[PDB]
């Protein structure tokens, strides 16, 4: 015995594909499977189940050929392939088998018979694949250099087709002929995933039912999977045994007086018979002696001996051959109108026979009479017995036959010389619990998972005795929404409950392909007691489900991979599961007379990315649905105007994606330019201003952003504004905000030097202007350092521009699914229209075209509806970018956390492939210190309050400082106001005022 290390793949079809992954669903040899190491140094007879894998390895031509067959002997057809010379041979006659075909010895073919094709024509492994399907015989082969000693090498390469043979002979046997290594393996329907390179050769492959990681790869259509959680398949339990409980009684149904009756009755006086409390054997009637036919409406005759019915009613009457076709629902005729009427929902069968030997005598038989007119049509299953004279005219009659008044009944001229159309016929109709069938029984099981077969009721579930109190006349108990959860047995009298089998989803947790190759699985909402072979030492139960493959730790981290109920998973570099931790523990030393004031500050820059617009598309109807066809276009005009509406909706979407750009970017009437000389007070702006040395005229950050991210009646329209115009608008806004402050958004632009503008902005947060002027160099250095780190951070992990990439991907996945839906039948014969017409004639070729039109129409409506919902989400984002530009670029915002984390100073815009990037500048304090505080000071019986500041104390003296930066000063009357005496306030202190 040996296994198979990823060996035995072949080219499925004759199609050239380049740099694309594909999914195929035909027979292969499953990876890592046991094979047989036959050694002949011997040749047994092996079976043939859907395919065989063959290989050999020898330095001399020991291997010669093969002898196929089904019942190998000299009595049936066969097949023979040998190579005894520089030529091959093929034959379909053979029929000369023996018990030792070892073969210039050629003692194999002792005889010959009716022969066929004569394709007589023109170490290392030699692998072959044989399969016989669709009446054709196909083989595959390849030869490769090899050096080995025991079994097989590693690596792989696919096999190419060699020949074909329209044999048509069934094969259920297989042999071999020698003159070393000889392996055998079998085939099985699986699903694979193959990768092609540019030249067109298979270079890699993965399976779909080997390991969970392979399942994840197949469901994601890639060979590398990033970290996360994924939904792969579903899980359900299969039944084990079967239960066929059935009624108790036994008695053969009486059919002799029904079918083998001696004397029948007249059609207008058809009898009615009732059969009950019996067990029938219907299948005997279905063979018997074929009477005329066995047309059955509503039920299938072949599968009849498994059903239980509640009442069986049979009627017998005599009619002629021509009126046989009238015994059916929806039929018209004298028999159908005034003799027998069948309801349109008749669930039964019709059996008749020719009785020219018993109901016909020489001279005609007048015993049988039929009705030919009445006042009104008979209701279904209604019999008329009145013999009153019918009045067919204006002249009245009273019990006398004559002119315009004829007898309602007429006799049949049943003469033995009459034709088969006039020969007598007897017809019996059966109109289908008490009348059961020939079944068996089986003991009932509790608390197991079985499939039940009661009288006409089938399903799966766990049967349990339940305390369902029942009124003593009812059997079927149901819960809300009509679920059947109670049955009464056909043998005993007990009440059970029906509960379903456990089911749930399956999810796989992975830390990444390039990190490791181990996974853990999570069976959702399933207890760890009904999940056998999956099995391991690590079984843990959570609120979400059962987790197999991870350990439990008692320490809390900051989690990355979510599972549920506050439980996350990670990798130790070994997969662990734990509980989340919200954050660090902190506590502020609160006190009645304590305060903290910062002594320094920092400057920070933070980015933000927002999408603005999507891609504009337009779809034509008649090209997508019918396509270069004149017959299909006619059938679409009866559906109305379902195609003007779609174009109107798409156009309405397309127009709206051009006012978002105008609303965001077009907010300046004029175009401003920067001064030639750049001396702005020590600040450097070279990383956001446009450069003249590059042809594109774009800033370095814009260049990095623009480099980082990127038939059948489908068109793409171009946008109105180009990228260059957007760049011009951005440059104008930047120049205006640099050289003019915030004055250009509310009137004419007014010049102001930059440090004075920055000093104005410091006043808007609560810091005096002197702090800026005495720390100019430090602030300039910090600002210049902040800008330089944006480029590196954006050149870091590509997850920075996540938001804009998802818009591109979603808008391309949807367009791919639409095109792929043009290759589905939707319940027809073919997907292409040129084979429907070229194989069917018009009257019924049209019904198969309306089925492709309905499917191809509701596939378009799904596309249009989802686009509208996605266009509503972007418009929300577009309206938030316009607000930010007005309030955070053309002004200073006092709204907390609206643009930046901290205190706002100024912002700058930059352009992205489909959105906008903001750069926020923010003031942040640091280097705190501790102090003691008081609310007021009493001096000469007066209360003194600060004007703008806080009272502080170093331990021996008192001062006054601003609230955001430490700057002590001496208390005087110039920075204090007085109100009231000092015997009311709580916490007052004594000091002096100068």
Ligand X SMILES: *[C@@H]1O[C@H](CO)[C@@H](O)[C@H](O)[C@H]1NC(C)=O
Ligand Y SMILES: *[C@@H]1O[C@H](CO)[C@@H](O[C@@H]2O[C@H](CO)[C@@H](O)[C@H](O)[C@H]2NC(C)=O)[C@H](O)[C@H]1NC(C)=O
Judged by DSSP in three states, 606 sits in strand
319: left (phi over 0), alpha (psi -120 to 50) or beta: beta
Q: Which one of the spans 594-602, 638-646, 648-656, 969-977 is the region binding ligand X (CB under 6 A)? A: 594-602
> Which one, 830 or 930, has the nearer CB to another protein?
930
At its nearest, how many Å lie between ligand X and the CB of residue 239? 25
How far apart are alpha carbons 55 and 69 in whole angstroms?
A: 20
Judged by DSSP in three states, 813 sits in helix
> Which one, 707 or 799, has the nearer CB to ligand Y?
707
> Which one, 472 or 842, has the nearer CB to ligand X?
472
Q: Which one of the spans 424-432, 588-596, 718-726, 912-920 is the region binding ligand X (CB under 6 A)? A: 588-596
Binder of residue 954, out of another protein, ligand X, ligand Y, none (CB less than 5 to 8 A by kind): ligand Y
**Number of Cβ within a 10 Å radius of residue 684:** 13
> Which one, 422 or 966, has the nearer CB to ligand X?
966
Q: Does the footprint of ligand Y cover residue 989 (CB under 6 A)?
A: yes
Binder of residue 901, out of another protein, ligand X, ligand Y, none (CB less than 5 to 8 A by kind): another protein
Q: Which of 907, 889, 895, 900 lies closest to 664 in space, CA to CA?
A: 889
Report the residue number whose CB is nearest to ligand Y.
954
Cα dist from 819 to 124, 669, 822, whole Å? 46, 45, 6
Residue burial 205-219, b: 16+ Cβ < 10 Å; e: rest? bbbbeeebbebbbbe
Q: Does the footprint of ligand Y cover residue 687 (CB under 6 A)?
A: yes
How far apart are alpha carbons 439 and 451 in whole angstroms?
A: 16
Q: What does the chain come to in residues?
A: 994
Judged by DSSP in three states, 773 sits in helix
Q: Does the footprint of ligand X cover residue 785 (CB under 6 A)?
A: no
Q: Does the footprint of ligand Y cover residue 676 (CB under 6 A)?
A: no
Binder of residue 249, out of another protein, ligand Y, ligand X, none (CB less than 5 to 8 A by kind): ligand X
Q: Does the footprint of another protein cover residue 505 (CB under 8 A)?
A: yes
Q: Which one of the spans 260-268, 530-538, 569-577, 587-595 is the region binding ligand X (CB under 6 A)? A: 587-595
Q: Does the CA dihedral 674-675-681-684 come out positive or negative?
A: positive
How far apart are alpha carbons 634 and 944 in whole angstroms?
A: 95
Q: Does the footprint of ligand Y cover residue 782 (CB under 6 A)?
A: no
> Which one, 929 or 957, has the nearer CB to ligand Y?
957
HSE (CB half, 13 Å, CA atoms) of 698?
19
Options 47, 298, 562, 802; binder of another protein; rule CB under 8 A: 562
Of 177-206, binders to ligand X (CB under 6 A) are: 198-199
Options 710, 956, 979, 992; binder of ligand Y; rule CB under 6 A: 956
Q: Does the footprint of another protein cover residue 565 (CB under 8 A)?
A: yes
Q: Does the footprint of another protein cover residue 950 (CB under 8 A)?
A: no
How far apart are alpha carbons 473 and 499 in whole angstroms?
A: 23
- Contact between 247 and 491 under an 8 Å Cβ cutoff? The reply is yes
At its nearest, how many Å lie between another protein and the CB of residue 452? 17
Q: Does the footprint of ligand X cover residue 984 (CB under 6 A)?
A: no
Of 524-553, binders to another protein (CB under 8 A) are: 524-525, 543-544
**Number of Cβ within a 10 Å radius of residue 13:** 9
Q: What is the DSSP letter of 154?
A: S
> Which one, 579 or 687, has the nearer CB to ligand Y?
687
At its nearest, how many Å lie between ligand X and the CB of residue 17? 15
> Which one, 478 or 789, has the nearer CB to ligand Y?
789
Binder of residue 896, out of another protein, ligand Y, ligand X, none (CB less than 5 to 8 A by kind): another protein
What are the structure tokens assigned to 323, written together? 């009126």
- Contact between 207 and 30 under an 8 Å Cβ cutoff? The reply is yes
Q: Does the footprint of ligand Y cover residue 693 (CB under 6 A)?
A: no
Binder of residue 505, out of ligand X, ligand Y, another protein, none (CB less than 5 to 8 A by kind): another protein
How far apart are alpha carbons 446 and 241 in whole angstroms?
A: 12
Q: Which of 964, 961, 966 lies closest to 903 in space, CA to CA?
A: 964
**β-pairing verdict for 192-196 and 188-189:** unpaired
Q: Does the footprint of another protein cover residue 301 (CB under 8 A)?
A: no
Options 596, 635, 847, 868; binder of ligand X; rule CB under 6 A: 596
Cβ-based neighbours of 915, under 8 Å, separated by 6 or more: 609, 610, 611, 612, 803, 804, 881
Return the HEC string of 676-725: CCCCCCCCCCCCCCCCCCCCCCCCHHHHHHHHHCCCCCEEECCCCCCHHH
Cβ-based neighbours of 388, under 8 Å, separated by 6 or more: 399, 408
How far apart are alpha carbons 853 and 839 in whole angstroms?
A: 19
In sequence order, what DSSP letters do the residues of 291-304 get, joined into one string?
Answer: -S---EESS-SSS-
Q: Which one of the spans 228-236, 622-630, 681-689, 830-838 is the region binding ligand Y (CB under 6 A)? A: 681-689
Beta bridge pairs of residue 402: 405
> Which one, 333 or 925, has the nearer CB to ligand X?
925
- Contact between 372 and 384 under an 8 Å Cβ cutoff? The reply is no
Q: What is the DSSP letter of 306?
A: T
Q: Does the footprint of another protein cover residue 483 (CB under 8 A)?
A: yes
Q: Does the footprint of ligand X cover residue 602 (CB under 6 A)?
A: yes
> Which one, 764 or 935, has the nearer CB to ligand X?
935
How far apart are alpha carbons 488 and 715 in whole angstroms?
A: 64
What are the structure tokens assigned to 264, written together? 């029948």
Q: Does the footprint of ligand X cover residue 883 (CB under 6 A)?
A: no
Options 419, 459, 512, 564; binder of another protein; rule CB under 8 A: 564
Q: Does the footprint of another protein cover residue 924 (CB under 8 A)?
A: yes
At its nearest, how many Å lie between another protein and the CB of residue 501? 11
Options 100, 955, 979, 992; binder of ligand Y; rule CB under 6 A: 955
How far apart are alpha carbons 497 and 485 in whole angstroms?
A: 5
Beta bridge pairs of residue 354: 425
Q: Does the footprint of ligand Y cover residue 686 (CB under 6 A)?
A: yes
What are the structure tokens assigned to 424, written together? 């007598």
Options 957, 973, 977, 980; binder of ligand Y; rule CB under 6 A: 957
Annotate each residue in 173-202 with x if it binds another protein (CB under 8 A) or - if it does not, as one string: ------------------------------
Binder of residue 543, out of another protein, ligand X, ligand Y, none (CB less than 5 to 8 A by kind): another protein
- Contact between 195 and 205 under an 8 Å Cβ cutoff? The reply is yes
Annotate each residue in 508-527 with x if it binds another protein (CB under 8 A) or - if it does not, as one string: ----------------xx--
R_g of the chain, CA atoms, integer Å: 46
Annotate each residue in 217-256 with x if it binds ligand X (CB under 6 A) or - if it does not, as one string: -------------------------------xx-------
Q: Does the footprint of ligand X cover residue 600 (CB under 6 A)?
A: yes
From first CA to last CA, the distance across the chain in angstroms is 106
Options 481, 584, 589, 872; binder of ligand X; rule CB under 6 A: 589
At its nearest, how many Å lie between another protein and the CB of residue 625? 33
At its nearest, how many Å lie between ligand Y and the CB of residue 936? 11
> Which one, 170 or 277, has the nearer CB to ligand X?
277
Q: What is the DSSP letter of 392?
A: -
Which positions touch ligand Y (CB under 6 A)? 684, 686-687, 954-957, 989-990
Q: What is the contact surface with another protein in residues (CB under 8 A)?
A: 480-481, 483, 500, 503-505, 524-525, 543-544, 562, 564-566, 580, 582, 588, 590, 598, 896-897, 901-903, 924-926, 928
Where on the chain is the footprint of ligand X (CB under 6 A)?
A: 198-199, 248-249, 491, 589, 591-592, 594, 596, 600, 602, 928, 930, 987
């Amino acid at each position: 015995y040996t296994n198979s290390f990823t060996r035995g793949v072949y080219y499925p079809d004759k199609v050239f594909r380049s740099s694309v992954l594909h999914s195929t669903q035909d027979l292969f040899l499953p990876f890592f499977s046991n094979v047989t190491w036959f050694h002949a140094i011997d040749n047994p007879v092996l079976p043939f189940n859907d395919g065989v894998y063959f290989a050999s390895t020898e330095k001399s031509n020991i291997i010669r050929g093969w002898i196929f067959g089904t019942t190998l002997d000299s009595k049936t057809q066969s097949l023979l392939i040998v190579n005894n010379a520089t030529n091959v041979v093929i034959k379909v006659c053979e029929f000369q088998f023996c018990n030792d075909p070892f073969l210039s010895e050629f003692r194999v073919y002792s005889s010959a018979n009716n022969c066929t094709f004569e394709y007589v024509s023109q170490k290392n492994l030699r692998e072959f694949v044989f399969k016989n399907i669709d009446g054709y015989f196909k083989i595959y082969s390849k030869h490769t250099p090899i050096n080995l000693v025991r079994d097989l090498p590693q690596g792989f390469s696919a096999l190419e087709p060699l020949v074909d043979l329209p044999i048509g002979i069934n094969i259920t046997r297989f042999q071999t002929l020698l003159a070393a290594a000889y392996y055998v393996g079998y085939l099985q329907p699986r699903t694979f995933l193959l990768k092609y390179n540019e030249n067109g050769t298979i270079t890699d492959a993965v399976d779909c039912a080997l390991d969970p990681l392979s399942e994840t790869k197949c469901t994601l259509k890639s060979f590398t999977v990033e970290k996360g959680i994924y939904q792969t398949s579903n899980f359900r339990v299969q039944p084990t045994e079967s239960i066929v409980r059935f009624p108790n009684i036994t008695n053969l149904c009486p059919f002799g007086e029904v079918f083998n009756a001696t004397r029948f009755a007249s059609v207008y006086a058809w009898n009615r018979k009732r059969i009950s409390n019996c067990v029938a054997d219907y299948s005997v009637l279905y063979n018997s002696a074929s009477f005329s036919t066995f047309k059955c409406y509503g039920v299938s005759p072949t599968k009849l001996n498994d059903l239980c019915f509640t009442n069986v009613y049979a009627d017998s009457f005599v009619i002629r051959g021509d009126e046989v076709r009238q015994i059916a629902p929806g039929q018209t005729g004298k028999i159908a109108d005034y003799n027998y009427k069948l309801p349109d929902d008749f669930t039964g069968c019709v059996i008749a026979w020719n009785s020219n030997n018993l109901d016909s005598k020489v001279g005609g038989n007048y015993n049988y009479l039929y009705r030919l007119f009445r006042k009104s049509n008979l209701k279904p299953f209604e019999r008329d017995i009145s013999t009153e004279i019918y009045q067919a005219g204006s002249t009245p009659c009273n019990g006398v036959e004559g002119f315009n008044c004829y007898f309602p009944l007429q006799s049949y001229g049943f003469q033995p010389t009459n034709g088969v159309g006039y020969q007598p016929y007897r017809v019996v109709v059966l109109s289908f619990a008490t009348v059961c069938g020939p079944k068996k029984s089986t003991n009932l099981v509790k608390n197991k998972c079985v499939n039940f077969n009661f009288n006409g009721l089938t399903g799966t579930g766990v049967l349990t005795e339940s305390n369902k109190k029942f009124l003593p006349f009812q059997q079927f108990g149901r819960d809300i929404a009509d679920t059947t959860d109670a049955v009464r047995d056909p043998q005993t009298l007990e009440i059970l409950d029906i509960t379903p089998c456990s089911f749930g989803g399956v999810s796989v947790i992975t830390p990444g392909t390039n990190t490791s190759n181990q996974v853990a699985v999570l069976y959702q909402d399933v207890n760890c007691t009904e999940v056998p072979v999956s099995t391991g030492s690590n079984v843990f139960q959570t609120r979400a489900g059962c987790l197999i493959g991870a350990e439990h730790v008692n320490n809390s981290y900051e989690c990355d991979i979510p599972i549920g109920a506050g439980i996350c998973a990670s990798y130790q570099t070994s997969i662990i599961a734990y509980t989340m931790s919200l954050g660090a523990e902190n506590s502020v030393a609160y006190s009645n007379n304590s305060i903290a004031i910062p002594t320094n500050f920092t400057i920070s820059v933070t980015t933000e990315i927002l999408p603005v617009s999507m891609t504009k598309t337009s779809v034509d109807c008649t090209m997508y649905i019918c396509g270069d066809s004149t017959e299909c276009s006619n059938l679409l005009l009866q559906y109305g105007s379902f195609c003007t509406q779609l174009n109107r909706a798409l156009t309405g979407i397309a127009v709206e994606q051009d006012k978002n750009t105008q609303e965001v970017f077009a907010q300046v009437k004029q175009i401003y330019k920067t001064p030639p000389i750049k001396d702005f007070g020590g600040f450097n702006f070279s990383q956001i201003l446009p450069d003249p040395s590059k042809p594109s005229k774009r800033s370095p950050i814009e260049d990095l952003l623009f480099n980082k991210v990127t038939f059948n009646g489908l068109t793409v329209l171009p946008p109105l504004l180009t990228d260059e115009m957007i760049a011009q608008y951005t440059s104008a806004l930047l120049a205006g905000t640099i050289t003019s402050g915030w004055t250009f958004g509310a009137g004419p632009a007014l010049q102001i030097p930059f440090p004075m503008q920055m000093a104005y902005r410091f006043n808007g947060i609560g810091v005096t202007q002197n702090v800026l002027y005495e720390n100019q160099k430090l602030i300039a250095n910090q600002f210049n350092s902040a800008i330089g780190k944006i480029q590196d951070s954006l050149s870091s992990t590509p997850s920075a521009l996540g938001k804009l990439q998802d818009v591109v991907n979603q808008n391309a996945q949807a367009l791919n699914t639409l095109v792929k839906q043009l290759s589905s039948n939707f319940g027809a014969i073919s997907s292409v229209l040129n084979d429907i017409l070229s194989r069917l004639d018009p009257p019924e070729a049209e019904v198969q075209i309306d089925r492709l039109i309905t499917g191809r129409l509701q596939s378009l409506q799904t596309y249009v509806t989802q686009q509208l919902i996605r266009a509503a989400e972007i418009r929300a984002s577009a309206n938030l970018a316009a607000t930010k530009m007005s309030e955070c670029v053309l002004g200073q915002s006092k709204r907390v956390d609206f643009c930046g984390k901290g205190y706002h100073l100024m912002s700058f815009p930059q352009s992205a492939p489909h959105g906008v990037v903001f750069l926020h500048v923010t003031y942040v304090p640091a280097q705190e210190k501790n102090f003691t505080t008081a609310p007021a000071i009493c001096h000469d019986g007066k209360a003194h309050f600060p004007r703008e500041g806080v009272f502080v104390s170093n331990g021996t003296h008192w001062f006054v400082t601003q609230r955001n930066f430490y700057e002590p000063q001496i208390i005087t009357t110039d920075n204090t106001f007085v109100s009231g005496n000092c015997d009311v306030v709580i916490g007052i202190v004594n000091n002096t005022v100068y």
